[PDB]
Amino acid sequence: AAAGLTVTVTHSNEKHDLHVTSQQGSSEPVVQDLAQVVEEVIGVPQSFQKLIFKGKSLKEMETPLSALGIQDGCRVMLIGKKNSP
């Protein structure tokens, strides 16, 4: 029952076409799931990581981006510094 969706994450000249799916019991991928994927791939904390989609600011952790308008072919910008604790 994985709700797969394709997003093009871009940061620091580095780009990935990620097929991410909802994991934390949600019917659609959400900000929590995307933040978890981002932290697994890189490690930026949710406090200072910045996800930008269509010029819309990501401030609410519970807002579903699938409802906000992410579809296949959509691109998002990741802003932050890769932290290696």
Added chain:
Amino acid sequence: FLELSEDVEEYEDLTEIMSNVQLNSNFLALARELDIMEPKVPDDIYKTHLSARMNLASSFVNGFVNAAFGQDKLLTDDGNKWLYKNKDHGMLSAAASLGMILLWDVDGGLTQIDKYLYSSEDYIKSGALLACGIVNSGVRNECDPALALLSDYVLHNSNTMRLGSIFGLGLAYAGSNREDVLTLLLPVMGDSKSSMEVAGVTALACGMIAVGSCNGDVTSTILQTIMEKSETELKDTYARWLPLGLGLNHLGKGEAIEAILAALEVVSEPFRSFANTLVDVCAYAGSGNV
């Protein structure tokens, strides 16, 4: 930017090359192929073989020289030290010069300005926001990071932070003619708490966004703000940006400027005689009207 549908073939490449995404990559590649990449020092530009404002000018010219490159450690490694050593009002301009170095470099510039975004000084924060605006200026982006990055600062109460964000959005959406950006910045134009020069900068941003568009709501907001502002404080030294915005919005059109000047005729002579002339010449630029 031409806003079209994906039904066309190779629409992704078309919109990318229209967005100038590969502009920066090609420009750096050709600069390297010319060997013209080394960061040229403002000092050996000055030829010093034989002070706060002078150092500010040195930083500005360094940014001009290294613009669009994004390769300058002078404001990257010890940039925090340089801005701390800097005095009074110039930290904003120093950060904006760093953004000038990083212009057209979306990915690298955003990462190298994210650290300075959380700076302590209000001037440094506003300069970082303006640097972001410069970085995204000219080059178009699919997700358009500037709109989301400038979220609280767009109408932020602090004059300097709001100024930086507004100028950045103007430089970014310059020529975009984006309905969302316009509908977000014109209410900021409508703010009364902002200073006279802040309102002028809002007008400048709106004009550079809607240049050559004849944006009627932008013009009406401009005229309404001019009317609401009292003439005595209007005609001092800074209302000269509202006619500039009008001229940008009606750039290269002509003829219809009679309606704008008739609407503006209510204004007192000292500023009306300037504003109508400015908007007329801007509208009739590139025509040879003897």
